[PDB]
Design a protein around this ligand. Structure first.
Ligand SMILES: Nc1nc2c(ncn2[C@@H]2O[C@H](COP(=O)(O)O)[C@@H](O)[C@H]2O)c(=O)[nH]1
Ligand SMILES: *C(=O)[C@H](CCSC)NC=O
Ligand SMILES: [Mg+2]
Ligand SMILES: [Mg+2]
Ligand SMILES: [Mg+2]
Ligand SMILES: [Mg+2]
Ligand SMILES: [Mg+2]
Ligand SMILES: [Mg+2]
Ligand SMILES: [Mg+2]
Ligand SMILES: [Mg+2]
Ligand SMILES: [Mg+2]
Ligand SMILES: [Mg+2]
Ligand SMILES: [Mg+2]
Ligand SMILES: [Mg+2]
Ligand SMILES: [Mg+2]
Ligand SMILES: [Mg+2]
Ligand SMILES: [Mg+2]
Ligand SMILES: [Mg+2]
Ligand SMILES: [Mg+2]
Ligand SMILES: [Mg+2]
Ligand SMILES: [Mg+2]
Ligand SMILES: [Mg+2]
Ligand SMILES: [Mg+2]
Ligand SMILES: [Mg+2]
Ligand SMILES: [Mg+2]
Ligand SMILES: [Mg+2]
Ligand SMILES: [Mg+2]
Ligand SMILES: [Mg+2]
Ligand SMILES: [Mg+2]
Ligand SMILES: [Mg+2]
Ligand SMILES: [Mg+2]
Ligand SMILES: [Mg+2]
Ligand SMILES: [Mg+2]
Ligand SMILES: [Mg+2]
Ligand SMILES: [Mg+2]
Ligand SMILES: [Mg+2]
Ligand SMILES: [Mg+2]
Ligand SMILES: [Mg+2]
Ligand SMILES: [Mg+2]
Ligand SMILES: [Mg+2]
Ligand SMILES: [Mg+2]
Ligand SMILES: [Mg+2]
Ligand SMILES: [Mg+2]
Ligand SMILES: [Mg+2]
Ligand SMILES: [Mg+2]
Ligand SMILES: [Mg+2]
Ligand SMILES: [Mg+2]
Ligand SMILES: [Mg+2]
Ligand SMILES: [Mg+2]
Ligand SMILES: [Mg+2]
Ligand SMILES: [Mg+2]
Ligand SMILES: [Mg+2]
Ligand SMILES: [Mg+2]
Ligand SMILES: [Mg+2]
Ligand SMILES: [Mg+2]
Ligand SMILES: [Mg+2]
Ligand SMILES: [Mg+2]
Ligand SMILES: [Mg+2]
Ligand SMILES: [Mg+2]
Ligand SMILES: [Mg+2]
Ligand SMILES: [Mg+2]
Ligand SMILES: [Mg+2]
Ligand SMILES: [Mg+2]
Ligand SMILES: [Mg+2]
Ligand SMILES: [Mg+2]
Ligand SMILES: [Mg+2]
Ligand SMILES: [Mg+2]
Ligand SMILES: [Mg+2]
Ligand SMILES: [Mg+2]
Ligand SMILES: [Mg+2]
Ligand SMILES: [Mg+2]
Ligand SMILES: [Mg+2]
Ligand SMILES: [Mg+2]
Ligand SMILES: [Mg+2]
Ligand SMILES: [Mg+2]
Ligand SMILES: [Mg+2]
Ligand SMILES: [Mg+2]
Ligand SMILES: [Mg+2]
Ligand SMILES: [Mg+2]
Ligand SMILES: [Mg+2]
Ligand SMILES: [Mg+2]
Ligand SMILES: [Mg+2]
Ligand SMILES: [Mg+2]
Ligand SMILES: [Mg+2]
Ligand SMILES: [Mg+2]
Ligand SMILES: [Mg+2]
Ligand SMILES: [Mg+2]
Ligand SMILES: [Mg+2]
Ligand SMILES: [Mg+2]
Ligand SMILES: [Mg+2]
Ligand SMILES: [Mg+2]
Ligand SMILES: [Mg+2]
Ligand SMILES: [Mg+2]
Ligand SMILES: [Mg+2]
Ligand SMILES: [Mg+2]
Ligand SMILES: [Mg+2]
Ligand SMILES: [Mg+2]
Ligand SMILES: [Mg+2]
Ligand SMILES: [Mg+2]
Ligand SMILES: [Zn+2]
Lengths: 246, 110, 153
RNA sequence: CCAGCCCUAGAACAGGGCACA
RNA sequence: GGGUUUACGACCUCGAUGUUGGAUCAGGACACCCAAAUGGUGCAACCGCUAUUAAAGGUUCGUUUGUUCAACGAUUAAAG
RNA sequence: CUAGCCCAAUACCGGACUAAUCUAUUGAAACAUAGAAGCAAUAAUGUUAAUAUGAGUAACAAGAAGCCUUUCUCCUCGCACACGCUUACAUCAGUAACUAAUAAUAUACUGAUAAUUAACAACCAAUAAACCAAAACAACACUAAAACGUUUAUUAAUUACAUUGUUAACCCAACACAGGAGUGCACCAAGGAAAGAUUAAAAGAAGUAAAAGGAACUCGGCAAACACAAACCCCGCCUGUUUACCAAAAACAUCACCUCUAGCAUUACUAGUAUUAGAGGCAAUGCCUGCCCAGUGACACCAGUUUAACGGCCGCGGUAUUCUGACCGUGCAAAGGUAGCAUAAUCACUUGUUCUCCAAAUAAGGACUUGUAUGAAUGGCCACACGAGGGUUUUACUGUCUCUUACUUCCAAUCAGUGAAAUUAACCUUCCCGUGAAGAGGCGGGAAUAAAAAAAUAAGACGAGAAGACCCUAUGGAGCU
RNA sequence: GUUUAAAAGAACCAACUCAUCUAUGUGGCAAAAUAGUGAGAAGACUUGUAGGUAGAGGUGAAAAGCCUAACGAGCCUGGU
RNA sequence: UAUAGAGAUAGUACCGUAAGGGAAAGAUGAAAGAAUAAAAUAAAAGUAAAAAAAAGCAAAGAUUACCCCUUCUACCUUUU
RNA sequence: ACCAAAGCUAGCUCAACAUACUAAAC
């Protein structure tokens, strides 16, 4: 007669069991971006001409002292590190990561992108179908800036490299029922992004992993969705009156 | 008396699925033209009545705070005014309750 | 067989029903608007009308005085009944109360509930059910019929 | 036609009334 | 010929078919007590005695007794 | 006839195969040959666990409004201690679910934190002597002879603060149970709420009222009543005790009266001593208790004595015209039933006969009385008082009844929440006649027959409940003599 | 409390103790209760605490009663 | 191999005043410091998906066709 | 589709040997 129920699922963590951990948390990456590169508002008009863009890009890459000392730090920490063959590897990593997210290959996707890039690109898409492809690239990827974050508590250095890409992709996100949701699979839309890769320099392996994706604030808005959206108003209690904002 | 045999699921279903035991649909449901909530055509609106009841409870709370006793009822009429209002020539000589809230849109001055 | 019965059985008997109605009438006189069960309010409405009539009978009437003394349990409401409720009901004949069925009680009993209110009180007006305007299709058709009947005379 | 409200109609469901006033 | 009494038999029930009288409600048979239609009489009349047909409807209230019965009081068209 | 694998079955008997396991050798998309067994479940009112039917049925709960804990309507088992339970107590927070037989939330669930502080209570001198003289307002007394104390002498470590019980809405009854519970205070100044919300069907429970009659009802005046009185018998003298849980009595005990058994000392009887103490009978009191020691007991160890010890107290025939038999003959006994009462609580006949009571009586009371089976301490006859004992009358009273009715409350029906029980082979679960393990829903011959709810009545399901308690059987028991 | 020269195994009637009769209840509030009505109520009276008598027995104002909800003889264990 | 094997997760909860009796209850993964957690059965009885339409031990012969037609007195035990 | 279902382990049983037989905590 005396019986009760069990399995009341509750998640309650405290600072005492958080800090009495025997081994610290090994992080293969940092939280976010330390020094975000703010691009000039004239990219849309300088990307039209080849020489006037590449010249300014090389000037910005060579004249900044912070980027130069960071490249020197990466060079002294790991040999055979050159910036000339870096954009090709960055483009390869980008295309293979997008193909891995297309094929739903979470293992190779984890090997390619880092722990800050994986959730932001798998969470809202794990229940959908993607048809992404690579057709053309008008402007080759260009290394904009290079930064390095050194924390002396553990003695760990993370080298981040920002690469501006002008890419031409075909994106089509389908629904879990099979209907088209976002865009067509044949329209080669032009995208401009700034991929921030990161690498742990103290690590013996130290693979290059995509860390962040910067979009300029003046970038054109994304393509409209196919369906319509209703935005609800403030759900009013009986003893509350609506206030019309003007 | 005790049952002679076990009633089968067939007869049990025939008994407790008869339309006499099913929940009947209501056709007197309408929307309230004021707040848009659902109500019956012969019953007051729950939302509007809750608004009026909250306002009435606040008014009664203030009018009871005005009278420091349980057996202290006014022998004159009463008038409730809101922030930014003054007693008229017809409302003078009565008890006055003053609310800091602005006058609601449904409360008519009269 | 309950043919020709006008009072419903309430409480623990006739005296208990009288006491329940007396408490309800005291509350109604005090607050000018109360809410209770639909049956109890429907039973109390007639007593409220008769109480307003007895209050209109005057202050110096010993019958009305003792009736108010019996019914109004809180003795501070008898001057109220005789100097607020009765004077403000002078041109009216029988339209003293307003009873409206409110939704069922949110408690588990789901009782059929009503609200009773003395007309002309200092409280927010209940959301009374208003009829349709004359600008409705059917009402405009009936207005046209009425105008035709007026012109035909 | 049957929301509601009354009933000399009724356990529930049914049934009779709701314009004179 | 019937299966109302007592008996006879021991066929169904002893992992239960509860046993007399009453109260309530009665269903049915007729081998009819009354009521209805007749025959015979040693049927004068009133009362009777038998027999035939008919079962839609009735068939009382009390004292004693646990009583079914039984005795008694008052009646009823009769108290089957 | 055409093909075959070429002739039914209960108890018992025989044979050939065989499911699933383990082992020894094969096999390795799960098998073969052998050897072993905890070797096969449609049935034991079978065991365990889970599920259905009954059934969303029986049943269960929170007074009202309100400014939200403030005022109204009612009923009154409250405070403390002892005993007992141990934190269920207090503050804060939460309740989706678990406890409250439902919610609201919370003294009854969950978690954290706190608490009951000694002056009240517990533990808190011995050794000898003086001590007969009750408590009951105790002045003074009665019988049943009655707890409760000081003083004197010898030793009693001697020096602040020791230890322990301090909450509660509580205990014993499987339960937050209409039950059982010691003591001192008061009857409210303290405790609480009969209704979750409607309607006002039947039936059921409780109450109030009722024309005329007033027991005509019924086993009975049971119950009820505006009555709450007077008498007659039976049985027990009376008060009292008894079958906890179907019998409270006429049963037991009882004062009184009778029998037996004992001449006596350190644990009963008894710290008593025949006017005493035990083992018993019968029942106050009044009149009495008649005969018998033949048998069986007990004293006497054989005679003999004992019945207020166990127990018994007679036939057959004729007689005073015609009915009885004062009387006689004969026989057996230990004596042959005395007084009294008597159709009784007394075998049957019996509803014996008669008088009173009633209009009517197998009722009650008074008489007659062989009761051939009454009867005298296993006691017989009357009497006062007494009895929730068993019967009978007289008024009074009334719904007991003629002959029921009206209205309230709990029930009831609907709505909302929670939610059992006996029972159940499966049912797609009609009626009549017949038949049949001898009373049919299931068979036969006929009639009837859209399907499902809800509310009522109990004729049947040889309805449920309890392996009939009556009867019999058992080479089954047990109590008593 | 009342009546009594009375604390009289007297009387009326409370607390209290029993349980006469009826009606509900009958898997119920309850493995014996509720309501009304009853009997005793200064005594052979009720009752608190603590101890004793233990089953071939105890105790018994004999009902073959009671001895931890089933007693013509408790319950548990073992024989089993 | 968790209704088995010791009663045993334990002589513990719980039931009795006591002696004494005496249980049931475990199942992921290398990692849950992999619960926007991943895969195999979705196979008992009981329900839902999906209440029922004359007639009858509920089936069989069948049939274009679920019933409608025709035929068969549930099973064990105990008994003549 | 709910209710549910399946693990292989905890451990037990019977013997042999055996120090020689009321474990640990006290
Ligand atoms: N003694 C005896 N009993 C028989 C014989 N045959 C049948 N029975 C009994 O009859 C019963 C079964 O009836 P049956 O199956 O023979 O009709 C069983 O009790 C069985 O023992 C017989 O030949 N001799
Ligand atoms: C007699 O017929 C019997 C009585 C037994 S009571 C001693 N009744 C039923 O079996
Ligand atoms: Mg109509
Ligand atoms: Mg016969
Ligand atoms: Mg014969
Ligand atoms: Mg026989
Ligand atoms: Mg024979
Ligand atoms: Mg029998
Ligand atoms: Mg049977
Ligand atoms: Mg008849
Ligand atoms: Mg005839
Ligand atoms: Mg005639
Ligand atoms: Mg007849
Ligand atoms: Mg042949
Ligand atoms: Mg054969
Ligand atoms: Mg084999
Ligand atoms: Mg076996
Ligand atoms: Mg099985
Ligand atoms: Mg049974
Ligand atoms: Mg059964
Ligand atoms: Mg079985
Ligand atoms: Mg159910
Ligand atoms: Mg319900
Ligand atoms: Mg039912
Ligand atoms: Mg009910
Ligand atoms: Mg306890
Ligand atoms: Mg609850
Ligand atoms: Mg708590
Ligand atoms: Mg206390
Ligand atoms: Mg009510
Ligand atoms: Mg209540
Ligand atoms: Mg209620
Ligand atoms: Mg009724
Ligand atoms: Mg009645
Ligand atoms: Mg009366
Ligand atoms: Mg009368
Ligand atoms: Mg009579
Ligand atoms: Mg009679
Ligand atoms: Mg009486
Ligand atoms: Mg009397
Ligand atoms: Mg009298
Ligand atoms: Mg006596
Ligand atoms: Mg005397
Ligand atoms: Mg005694
Ligand atoms: Mg008894
Ligand atoms: Mg007793
Ligand atoms: Mg009795
Ligand atoms: Mg008595
Ligand atoms: Mg005697
Ligand atoms: Mg003498
Ligand atoms: Mg005697
Ligand atoms: Mg005598
Ligand atoms: Mg003698
Ligand atoms: Mg002798
Ligand atoms: Mg001799
Ligand atoms: Mg005489
Ligand atoms: Mg006799
Ligand atoms: Mg009589
Ligand atoms: Mg004799
Ligand atoms: Mg004698
Ligand atoms: Mg003698
Ligand atoms: Mg008497
Ligand atoms: Mg007595
Ligand atoms: Mg008596
Ligand atoms: Mg009437
Ligand atoms: Mg049928
Ligand atoms: Mg047969
Ligand atoms: Mg048979
Ligand atoms: Mg038949
Ligand atoms: Mg047939
Ligand atoms: Mg037939
Ligand atoms: Mg025919
Ligand atoms: Mg029946
Ligand atoms: Mg019934
Ligand atoms: Mg049958
Ligand atoms: Mg029967
Ligand atoms: Mg039966
Ligand atoms: Mg038997
Ligand atoms: Mg019996
Ligand atoms: Mg016998
Ligand atoms: Mg034999
Ligand atoms: Mg033997
Ligand atoms: Mg006395
Ligand atoms: Mg009583
Ligand atoms: Mg009464
Ligand atoms: Mg009393
Ligand atoms: Mg008395
Ligand atoms: Mg007396
Ligand atoms: Mg003792
Ligand atoms: Mg013996
Ligand atoms: Mg003895
Ligand atoms: Mg005896
Ligand atoms: Mg006896
Ligand atoms: Mg016992
Ligand atoms: Mg086990
Ligand atoms: Mg076990
Ligand atoms: Mg299934
Ligand atoms: Mg058929
Ligand atoms: Mg037989
Ligand atoms: Zn509204």
């Amino acid at each position: 007669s005396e019986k009760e129920f069990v399995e009341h699922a509750r998640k309650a963590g405290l600072v005492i069991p958080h800090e009495r951990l025997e081994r610290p948390i090994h992080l293969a990456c940092t939280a976010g971006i330390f020094d975000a590169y703010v691009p000039p508002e004239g990219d849309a008009r300088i990307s039209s001409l080849s020489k006037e863009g590449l010249a300014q890009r090389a000037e910005r890459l060579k004249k900044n002292v912070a980027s130069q000392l960071s490249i020197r730090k990466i060079r002294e920490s790991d040999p055979n590190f050159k910036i000339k063959d870096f954009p090709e590897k960055a483009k390869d990593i980008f295309i293979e990561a997008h193909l891995c997210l297309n094929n739903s290959d979470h293992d190779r996707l984890h090997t390619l992108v880092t722990e800050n890039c994986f959730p932001d690109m798998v969470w809202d898409i794990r229940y959908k179908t993607v048809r992404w492809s690579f057709v053309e690239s008008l402007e080759p990827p260009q290394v904009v800036q290079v930064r390095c974050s050194s924390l002396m508590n553990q003695g760990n250095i993370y080298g981040q490299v920002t690469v501006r890409m002008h890419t031409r992709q075909t994106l089509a996100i389908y629904d879990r029922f099979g209907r088209l949701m976002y865009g067509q699979e044949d329209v080669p839309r032009d995208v401009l992004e700034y991929v921030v890769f990161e690498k742990h320099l103290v690590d013996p392996y130290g693979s290059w992993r995509m860390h962040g994706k910067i979009i300029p604030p003046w970038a054109p808005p994304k393509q409209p969705i196919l369906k319509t959206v209703m935005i609800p108003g403030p759900q009013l209690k009986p003893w509350e009156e609506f206030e019309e904002p003007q | 008396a005790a049952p002679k045999n076990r009633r089968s699921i067939e007869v049990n279903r025939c008994r407790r699925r008869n339309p006499q035991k099913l929940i009947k649909v209501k056709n007197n449901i309408d929307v309230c033209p004021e707040c848009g909530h659902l109500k019956q055509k012969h019953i007051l609106c729950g939302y509007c009545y809750e608004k009026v009841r909250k306002e009435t409870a606040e008014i009664r709370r203030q009018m009871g705070k005005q009278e420091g006793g349980p057996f202290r009822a006014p022998t004159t009429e009463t008038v409730v005014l809101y922030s930014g209002e003054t007693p008229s020539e017809q409302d003078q000589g009565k008890r006055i309750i003053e609310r800091e809230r602005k006058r609601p849109s449904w409360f008519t001055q009269n | 067989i309950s043919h020709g019965r006008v009072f419903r059985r309430l409480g623990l008997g006739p005296e208990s029903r009288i006491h329940l109605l007396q408490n309800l009438l005291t509350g109604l006189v005090r607050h000018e608007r109360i809410e209770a069960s639909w049956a109890r309010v429907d039973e109390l409405r007639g007593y409220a009308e008769k109480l307003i009539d007895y209050g209109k009978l005057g202050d110096t009437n010993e019958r009305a005085m003792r009736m108010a003394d019996f019914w109004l349990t809180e003795k501070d409401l008898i001057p109220k009944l005789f100097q607020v409720l009765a004077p403000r009901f002078q041109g009216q004949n029988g339209g003293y109360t307003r009873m409206l069925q409110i939704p069922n009680r949110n408690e588990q009993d789901r009782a059929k509930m009503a609200v009773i209110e003395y007309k002309g009180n200092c409280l927010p007006p209940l959301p009374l059910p208003r009829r349709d305007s004359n600008l409705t299709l059917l009402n405009q058709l009936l207005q046209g019929l009425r105008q035709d009947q007026e012109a035909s005379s």
